[PDB]
Amino acid sequence: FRIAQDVVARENDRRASALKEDYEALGANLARRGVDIEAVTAKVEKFFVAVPSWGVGTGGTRFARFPGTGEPRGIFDKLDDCAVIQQLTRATPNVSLHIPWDKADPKELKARGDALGLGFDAMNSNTFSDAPGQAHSYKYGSLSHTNAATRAQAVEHNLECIEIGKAIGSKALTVWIGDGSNFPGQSNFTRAFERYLSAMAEIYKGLPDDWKLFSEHKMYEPAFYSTVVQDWGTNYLIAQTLGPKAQCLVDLGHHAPNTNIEMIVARLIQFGKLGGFHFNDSKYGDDDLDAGAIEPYRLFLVFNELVDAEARGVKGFHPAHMIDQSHNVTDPIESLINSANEIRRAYAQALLVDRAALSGYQEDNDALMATETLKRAYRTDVEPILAEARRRTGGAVDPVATYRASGYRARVAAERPAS
Amino acid sequence: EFRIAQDVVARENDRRASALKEDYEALGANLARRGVDIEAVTAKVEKFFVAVPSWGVGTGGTRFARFPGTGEPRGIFDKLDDCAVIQQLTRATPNVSLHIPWDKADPKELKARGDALGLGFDAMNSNTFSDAPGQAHSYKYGSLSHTNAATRAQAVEHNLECIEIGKAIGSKALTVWIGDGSNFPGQSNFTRAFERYLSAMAEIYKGLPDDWKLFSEHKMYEPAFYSTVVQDWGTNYLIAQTLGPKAQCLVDLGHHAPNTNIEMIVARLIQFGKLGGFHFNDSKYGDDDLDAGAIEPYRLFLVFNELVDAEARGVKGFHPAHMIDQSHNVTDPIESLINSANEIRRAYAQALLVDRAALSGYQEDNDALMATETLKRAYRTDVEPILAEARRRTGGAVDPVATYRASGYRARVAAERPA
Amino acid sequence: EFRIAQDVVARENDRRASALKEDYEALGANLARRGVDIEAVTAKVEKFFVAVPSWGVGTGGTRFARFPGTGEPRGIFDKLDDCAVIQQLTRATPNVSLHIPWDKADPKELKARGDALGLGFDAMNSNTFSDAPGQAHSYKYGSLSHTNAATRAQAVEHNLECIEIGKAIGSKALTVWIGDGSNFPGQSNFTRAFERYLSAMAEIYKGLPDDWKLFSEHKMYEPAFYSTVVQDWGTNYLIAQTLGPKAQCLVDLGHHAPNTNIEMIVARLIQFGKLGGFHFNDSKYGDDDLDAGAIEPYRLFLVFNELVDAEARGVKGFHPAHMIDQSHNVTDPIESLINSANEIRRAYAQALLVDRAALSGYQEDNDALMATETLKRAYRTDVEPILAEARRRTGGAVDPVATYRASGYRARVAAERPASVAGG
Amino acid sequence: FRIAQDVVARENDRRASALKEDYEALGANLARRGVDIEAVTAKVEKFFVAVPSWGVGTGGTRFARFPGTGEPRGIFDKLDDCAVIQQLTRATPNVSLHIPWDKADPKELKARGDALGLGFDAMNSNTFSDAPGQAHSYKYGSLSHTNAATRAQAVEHNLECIEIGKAIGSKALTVWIGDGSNFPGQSNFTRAFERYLSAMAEIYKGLPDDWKLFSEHKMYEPAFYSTVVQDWGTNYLIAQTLGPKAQCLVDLGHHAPNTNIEMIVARLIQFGKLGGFHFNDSKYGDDDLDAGAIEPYRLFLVFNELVDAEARGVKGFHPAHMIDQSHNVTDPIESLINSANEIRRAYAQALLVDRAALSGYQEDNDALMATETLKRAYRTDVEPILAEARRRTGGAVDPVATYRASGYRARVAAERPASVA
Ligand SMILES: [Cu+2]
Ligand SMILES: [Cu+2]
Ligand SMILES: [Cu+2]
Ligand SMILES: [Cu+2]
Ligand SMILES: [Cu+2]
Ligand SMILES: [Cu+2]
Ligand SMILES: [Cu+2]
Ligand SMILES: [Cu+2]
């Protein structure tokens, strides 16, 4: 146990009384609205989102990085830190690794995971930066690089990622690359894409029967003129070309200004190519901010699309949900804890939507009541539900408060040497 | 007189009275546990007012088309009768903003009708973005900044007339928003056009009463699609500072570039005593003029957070003029203004809930997480019970839109007005 | 029949010839030193055409106001007389794109007038983004994707009629742009609306002749302000791939989110054989519909770089249905369309000056600098002489707008057409 | 000379022939337009833009940095490289320094500068990162940080920048900071700005009589929610508040999407607060790409505003221009050479605008001809002018070609050690 059980216990008790009042008040209110709060809590307590191994360390920009105390020394420290997130929120049972950063004996990763009660989610390849000994630089691209040998080196790396995942329990490989151009003319848009498709078809051949290959679009950064996998359109073209095992990943902050992201999710779902969602928030570009911190309503509107799919009865729909954020000015663990919470919060509120009444207002083109029906769920403070979900599953009524009372950060700060 | 039968208001309130009591008392207990007297909040909420635009009472359209609904108001007097409903039910819109020449009519009567309907008059709005019957000089290439002196003078005189009308009805401010700008590079000399504008505004200011305010309103684009004289708050500040003490800036939420941090702009203007007021509405792409809070409710709360904080910091003489400037193209105008007016009170109430002492503490300790969390604990709070109670205690409706539909008002005026 | 007197054209041409010969020869010498035969370029520029929107010759406005000029066309016939001017002076707009119901008239008359004016007819444009007098079902909440069956059916019926009118006048394609969408979250169900849109389009598709094409057009917003059924090229692609071989995509320059790489979209649609055509104009903030190349000439160039590159290589069946789609709110519509068309030919001609072999080499060497410099060398070249000589050789004007003004055509029709009032 | 003279001469002779042709042909066409090409060329060869000392190294992103061969390390390697740019384009006689990156003995800086034929431009302070052994961290800000000792440290540092500047010939201090917040509520907009203004006031006091203090706005990055100096509005309020010696810097890529940047330049000039413009290009955000490589017409429209002012010599308008770019996929030197070229190209084209005619069209509201009057100058290929200007002033006809012919890059790669190769 990363966090002393007696600490969690003391902290949960101190708030039990206040929780009981708010929850029961919310229960009565929901009952008046025809909603059984227990059924909502039952679903919330089982909603999981993956945590990125690389999100537990302090992030930075190209201008600087301001690390905090007790920064994780390697993958094992990161897993230890992810264990804290899961223990307190019970919403992040799985960890998503990034190779080569997390490269290590699979036997040992698995054992650490099992020992911590953590599982492993989608693997993540890295051909957007050069590693030591690398025979070919990824400066001008990787999977779509004009140099065949360079593309072969990227393919092999993705295949290795799969092998590693096969040994630890992972069932998918996420592929995000920087490939693109910074100057008009530097790249032949069409040929660069074909090279990419060619390299991806090879990675696809290495997929086990029950694995999936996720391609992730991004409007820009690191490329500032054009990007091979720039949007969901090109993303869909990829998944449809590769095969049943290939699907699209939608990362919130990877879209052009004012883009209607919730629609893209719907479109993808409609054609069964929504492989998963990468949560975070933003205001300007791919800011990778804590989910819900900037536009909480948009987060709820993304989930509205997710829940409506289930309501419509879409078949074999098990999206892979992962958090992909950067924490440049907060305790990484704390931001992940509250981000995971916002996600559960948006999900919970989406469950509160009266689809029946909604279905009616849409039919009569009653735009105002349709929107109001959505707002009634969104405006509901579901915090009590989230808190109760944690209590029942061994988590903390107030995760961050409990995290701070345990003095965890100071503990690891004294154990881990800064570099 | 009452546009909506008082027996309907009473009935539709008694039908919801029980539930409201339950919700209000629960919220009251919850705030008490948070050191907040719910009565202090309600008291301030029922005191918050925002003016309604006479032109918003009718159905709006785009350059592509206009799809009017039944019972469209024939003129200013019909529009006042519908504004009376908005006010009667929400009790948050005691004043109406007139637009000239659209609502030009015997001021003496307007006043009479206003007092009869329990309405007052807010800022006057001038119109030099369109030509009027008989007008001698077209505003096609501008108005106040037009290159032709005779044209600028005509625009000036029109604004002075606007002040004359407004003085007769009890108005205390003139709002100037023009489309002046260019659609082609080189079409206008930026500096000279602005100098022409300043000179004209100076003349209008000259004829402004000493108990009146002159509000200039910036906008990035439309109808001008390359450049706009008063394109942003920076230029707007220059205008206000230049003109004088009685001149201030008006911030319209949808008149800003993509991803602009509007709350910041609001704070800056307050700091330099130039925040004259607001034009509330929501948007996702451009100046969509959608119902407030329909797209980004958190942003609305943040704008209000700055207003409430300005008071907490001891800023003096701060009395912003709040106005709704929206276009309702696919809903009953009256129902939209009702809920928009409501969303604005909602954002105000949640902002009043912020624990400034605590927030201040986390800002000083650079505890970004708890700082944002402190803001969220207010925003997540469902303040609908306070809004409904406020309305109930002041002659309004627990559920405005519900009461509006139950009254059959729309069908009524549809039978009284042409098709 | 000549809308603009031949003597005036001849007069205004002879007045600039001396200067043109100098500039043309100087450029040719330069191009020659660059291993380029100027005559080969002029020959292709002469053959490049872009359709003119019948509604483009009338003064446009915004939701705030409309300030009409003098001599506004009363209907399709006046509009055709105005387009004839554009074609006579620029020689780059031989075909007009009609819009129903606005241009609803006897197909026999339309054709006769076009023939007499030396104009052909391009893609038909349907209208379900506004209600017509005597229309049974409003399009307020949608048309092809509307929740009410009768309303969709009515929309379907209308598009089929446009195909009929088109077959009679010589058209070979139907362009579909609708405002269908929502202004509020919840108002629409993204999936069910789209499904309805697909079903309806599948019907219109059945009424397409064997040599006709159906073009769907995406737009991020306006008139819908929260979500649009056909919001981007992604959805558009799904539409075209679902409908069939005769269904392609139209890319309207200003119908994209801020900072979108539009030229890549072109390339993407080309790569998958779904680039129905391009709708030119320029913009800075949104769907501004400004004169092409007036704001970002280089982007226009880059878009053509993709068009020419695709053309350069094995042109599968590549024959995009290009059309200008602009709104002229502060200029004489004819002069804007005249210069917009010239601008389009400018980007095209410069795209033809690109050293493809050299570009290909730098691309494979990942020589980003030289790659973008190779492109700039073409773009920087001032091709006005080629454009000017092209018009002259084909009975066009060396200085289109100058000739237009010198002819007095505007004052003329202004004297022949009823006055218009400004929209308040 | 970083580049041998025989190489420059040889590469110019090889292109002299065709240049005479193009130049003469352009001189004729301009003559027919009432424009004397010599007047234009004389002004172009005098148009300079400061080069950033950090612009010669390979740039990177938060995801990666892929250095090329012969990477300059330290202000001395850097100055050696900047000299290449100056010798070949003759458009960048001065270099802008960044402290602590280029911190070195002033005497040695002045020495190397005079030897390479380079002067020094505005000083650039750095409080958007922590230096080794720094008492207070700038994680949560610097000049507007909530902690007093932190602001004091930031102020003191900037003053240090002024001192270093007074000893090498610099006459200005540019101040761009990352200060802002990433979460609503994290910072109090007004109090953060007040602390900033109060700190800038202290720096301002340390300015000599002939020195200028430039503030630089930026919409976002590294702050992803709010930035204290987010736009020119706040910037103007800063310059106005600090005094006569304080002006605003406009960095092309530091604006919200679709912003009309040329208008901002005009407004600032009309009010005497435009301290200078930092050149680069962008398509998405602050991409810091090569000037005019994405939107050359926009670059021209900005210069159209600068040239209009330069013609009527506006009071308080003596801009300090500098290139501020990041080269991630090209040879920094080649990219800087060409960016400086694009900057001049735009300048030259703006100088071709018939101001009288334009003015007339604006008065009559003839938008078509007005925009066409700008296009005529813009559509003019002025490469012949820029090339002759370089040739007359000791530069190279084709800068990048000459540079490549000199094998300079390979040369410095042999002298400088790479991290691993
Ligand atoms: Cu990301
Ligand atoms: Cu991601
Ligand atoms: Cu507005
Ligand atoms: Cu407004
Ligand atoms: Cu359009
Ligand atoms: Cu179009
Ligand atoms: Cu800069
Ligand atoms: Cu920058």
CA–CA gap between residue C127 and residue C155 (Å, rounded): 9
Chain centre to alpha carbon of residue B66: 23
Tokens 């609205």 -> residue? A33
In this structure, what DSSP letter does residue C170 have?
T
Chain centre to alpha carbon of residue C93: 10
A379 shares contact with chain D (CB less than 8 Å): no
User: Do D285 and A220 count as a contact with CB atoms less than 8 A apart?
Assistant: yes
CA–CA gap between residue D17 and residue C421 (Å, rounded): 61
B184 shares contact with chain C (CB less than 8 Å): yes
User: Do B382 and A383 count as a contact with CB atoms less than 8 A apart?
Assistant: no
Amino acid letter at D292? Answer: G
Size of chain C in residues: 424
- At CB < 8 A and 24+ separation, what contacts does A354-363 make? A354/A33, A354/A34, A355/A308, A355/A311, A358/C186, A361/C186, A362/C147, A362/C186, A362/C187, A362/C188, A362/C189, A362/C192, A363/C147
Q: How many CB atoms lie within 10 A of CB A6?
A: 10
- Residue A74 to residues B167, B367, C33, D66, D195, Cα–Cα distance (Å): 73, 26, 61, 24, 39
CA–CA gap between residue B181 and residue B367 (Å, rounded): 45
Look up residue D329 and give its two tokens: 């996929």
On the 0-12 / 13-18 / 19+ scale of CB atoms within 10 A, C104 is middle
Tokens 């300030």 -> residue? C67
CA–CA gap between residue A302 and residue A293 (Å, rounded): 15
- Is the separation of the CB atoms in D70 and D411 below 8 Å? yes
Collect all residues of chain B within an 8 Å Cβ-Cβ radius of residue A369. Answer: 401
CA–CA gap between residue A41 and residue B271 (Å, rounded): 46
Nearest-Cα distance to chain A for C130, in Å, is 17
Amino acid letter at A230? Answer: Q
CA–CA gap between residue B127 and residue B154 (Å, rounded): 12
Collect all residues of chain D within an 8 Å Cβ-Cβ radius of residue B267. Answer: 189-190
Q: What is the CATH number of domain D1-421?
A: 3.20.20.150
Residue A264, beta-bridge partner list: none
In this structure, what DSSP letter does residue D209 have?
T
CA triple A33-A37-A43, angle to 5 deg: 125
- Is the separation of the CB atoms in D186 and B263 below 8 Å? no
CA–CA gap between residue C185 and residue A372 (Å, rounded): 9
**Which of D234, D259, D270 is facing B191, going by the closest CB pair?**
D270
CA–CA gap between residue C245 and residue C232 (Å, rounded): 20
Look up residue B391 and give its two tokens: 């309305």
- Is the separation of the CB atoms in C78 and C327 below 8 Å? no
Q: Taking ligand 4, which is a single-atom ion, which protein residues have CB atoms under 5 Å away?
A: B 252, 279, 325
| Beta pairing, strands C52-53 & B321-324 | unpaired
R_g of chain C, CA atoms, integer Å: 22
Residue A286, beta-bridge partner list: none
| Distance in Å, CA C291 to ligand 4 centroid | 28
Nearest-Cα distance to chain C for D301, in Å, is 10
DSSP H/E element including B277: strand B275-280
CA–CA gap between residue B338 and residue B344 (Å, rounded): 10
Look up residue C212 and give its two tokens: 């006709």
CA–CA gap between residue D290 and residue D345 (Å, rounded): 14
Q: How many CB atoms lie within 10 A of CB B8?
A: 17
- Residue A16 to residues A10, A340, A397, B72, Cα–Cα distance (Å): 10, 22, 8, 55
CA–CA gap between residue A117 and residue A119 (Å, rounded): 7
Ordered strands of the B124-125 beta sheet: B124-125, B173-176, B213-217, B247-252, B275-280, B321-324
H-type alpha helices, A313-382: 332-351, 355-363, 367-379
Grouping H, G, I as helix, E, B as strand and the rest as coil, residue C41 is: helix
R_g of chain D, CA atoms, integer Å: 22
Strand blocks (E) in A245-352: 246-251, 274-279, 320-323
Residue B250 backbone dihedrals phi, psi, to 5 degrees: -115, 125
- Is the separation of the CB atoms in A90 and A375 below 8 Å? no
User: Do A358 and C186 count as a contact with CB atoms less than 8 A apart?
Assistant: yes
CA–CA gap between residue B61 and residue D409 (Å, rounded): 62
| Distance in Å, CA D285 to ligand 8 centroid | 9
Collect all residues of chain D within an 8 Å Cβ-Cβ radius of residue A222. Answer: 61, 63-64, 328
Residue D213, beta-bridge partner list: D173, D246
Packing angle of the helix pair C356-365, C368-380 (nearest 10 deg): 160
CA–CA gap between residue D367 and residue C285 (Å, rounded): 19
Identify which of B158, B71, B32, B86 has the alpha carbon closest to the alpha carbon of residue B413.
B71
| Distance in Å, CA D284 to ligand 8 centroid | 12
CA–CA gap between residue A343 and residue A341 (Å, rounded): 5
Residue B250, beta-bridge partner list: B217, B277
- Residue D67 to residues A130, D326, D331, Cα–Cα distance (Å): 11, 12, 9
Q: What one-character-per-residue DSSP string does B18-58 give?
A: HHHHHHHHHHHHHHHTTT--HHHHHHHHTT---BEEGGGGS
D222 upstream amide cis, omega within 30 of 0: yes
Interface test with D, best of C67, C298, C342 (most D CBs within 10 A): C298
Is B217 labelled as part of a ligand binding site? yes
CA–CA gap between residue D297 and residue D295 (Å, rounded): 6
Q: What one-character-per-residue DSSP string does A146-161 give?
A: S-HHHHHHHHHHHHHH
Q: What is the CATH number of domain C1-424?
A: 3.20.20.150
CA–CA gap between residue B174 and residue B205 (Å, rounded): 10
Strand blocks (E) in D57-189: 94-98, 119-124, 172-175, 180-181
In this structure, what DSSP letter does residue A207 have?
-
User: Which approach determined this entry?
Assistant: X-ray
Residue B6 backbone dihedrals phi, psi, to 5 degrees: -65, -25
H-type alpha helices, C221-355: 233-243, 262-271, 297-312, 333-352
C224 shares contact with chain B (CB less than 8 Å): no
The most distant pair of C-alpha atoms in chain D lies apart, rounded to whole Å, by: 66
Q: Taking ligand 8, which is a single-atom ion, which protein residues have CB atoms under 5 Å away?
A: D 286
- Residue B249 to residues B51, B210, B213, B242, B283, Cα–Cα distance (Å): 17, 17, 10, 12, 20
In this structure, what DSSP letter does residue C291 have?
P
Nearest-Cα distance to chain D for C293, in Å, is 10
Amino acid letter at A138? Answer: Y
Cα four-point dihedral sign B336, B339, B344, B347: negative
Identify which of D276, D203, D189 has the alpha carbon closest to the alpha carbon of residue D243.
D203
Look up residue D115 and give its two tokens: 């030897």
Residue D48 backbone dihedrals phi, psi, to 5 degrees: -120, 160
Residue B51 backbone dihedrals phi, psi, to 5 degrees: -80, 155
CB proximity list for B77: less than 8 A, separation 6 or greater: B105, B109, B113
On the 0-12 / 13-18 / 19+ scale of CB atoms within 10 A, C167 is middle
In this structure, what DSSP letter does residue A418 have?
P
Ordered strands of the A119-120 beta sheet: A51-52, A94-96, A119-120
CA–CA gap between residue D129 and residue A96 (Å, rounded): 30
DSSP H/E element including A234: helix A232-242
Identify which of A380, A398, A379 has the alpha carbon closest to the alpha carbon of residue A388.
A398
Identify which of B173, B190, B193 has the alpha carbon closest to the alpha carbon of residue B246.
B173
| Beta pairing, strands B227-228 & B181-182 | antiparallel
- Is the separation of the CB atoms in C226 and C181 below 8 Å? yes
- Is the separation of the CB atoms in C293 and C282 below 8 Å? yes
User: Do A329 and D186 count as a contact with CB atoms less than 8 A apart?
Assistant: yes
Grouping H, G, I as helix, E, B as strand and the rest as coil, residue C282 is: strand
Nearest-Cα distance to chain D for A101, in Å, is 13
CA–CA gap between residue A411 and residue D174 (Å, rounded): 42
Domain spans in chain C, listed from the N-terminal domain onward: 1-424
Rounded to the nearest 10 degrees, how much is the dihedral formed by the CA atoms of B278, B283, B289, B290?
-110
In chain D, which residue's Cα lies nearest the Cα of C373?
A: D293
Collect all residues of chain A within an 8 Å Cβ-Cβ radius of residue B261. Answer: 283
Identify which of C195, C169, C197, C38 has the alpha carbon closest to the alpha carbon of residue C112.
C169
- Is the separation of the CB atoms in D219 and A284 below 8 Å? yes
- Is the separation of the CB atoms in A291 and A281 below 8 Å? yes
CB proximity list for B38: less than 8 A, separation 6 or greater: B24, B27, B28, B31, B32, B386
Q: Count Cβ–Cβ pairs < 8 Å, chain A vs chain B.
A: 71
Q: What one-character-per-residue DSSP string does D310-367 give?
A: HHTT-TT-----EE---BSSS-HHHHHHHHHHHHHHHHHHHHTS-HHHHHHHHHTT-H
| Distance in Å, CA C133 to ligand 6 centroid | 24
3-state helix, strand, coil in chain B (%, to 5): 50, 10, 40
Tokens 């992909």 -> residue? A324
Residue C323 backbone dihedrals phi, psi, to 5 degrees: -150, 150
Q: What one-character-per-residue DSSP string does A29-75 give?
A: HHHHTT--HHHHHHHHTT---BEEGGGSSPPB-SS-B---TT---SH
Residue C246 backbone dihedrals phi, psi, to 5 degrees: -85, 0
Resolution in A: 2.4
Number of helices and strands (H, E) in chain B? 15, 11
Relative to the alpha carbon of D218, which ligand is closest?
A: 8
**Domain B1-419 indexed as CATH 1.20.140.10:** no
| Distance in Å, CA B310 to ligand 4 centroid | 23
CA–CA gap between residue D162 and residue D200 (Å, rounded): 13
Q: How many CB atoms lie within 10 A of CB D420?
A: 7
Identify which of A294, A292, A222, A282 has the alpha carbon closest to the alpha carbon of residue A252.
A282
On the 0-12 / 13-18 / 19+ scale of CB atoms within 10 A, C202 is middle
CA–CA gap between residue A350 and residue D146 (Å, rounded): 39
Look up residue C52 and give its two tokens: 């003119």
Q: How many CB atoms lie within 10 A of CB B346?
A: 26
User: Do A331 and B401 count as a contact with CB atoms less than 8 A apart?
Assistant: no
Tokens 């002040």 -> residue? B163
- Is the separation of the CB atoms in B147 and D363 below 8 Å? yes
CA–CA gap between residue A165 and residue A207 (Å, rounded): 11
**Which of B295, B336, B373 is facing A368, going by the closest CB pair?**
B336
On the 0-12 / 13-18 / 19+ scale of CB atoms within 10 A, A348 is buried
D148 shares contact with chain C (CB less than 8 Å): no
DSSP H/E element including A227: strand A226-227
Collect all residues of chain A within an 8 Å Cβ-Cβ radius of residue D282. Answer: 224
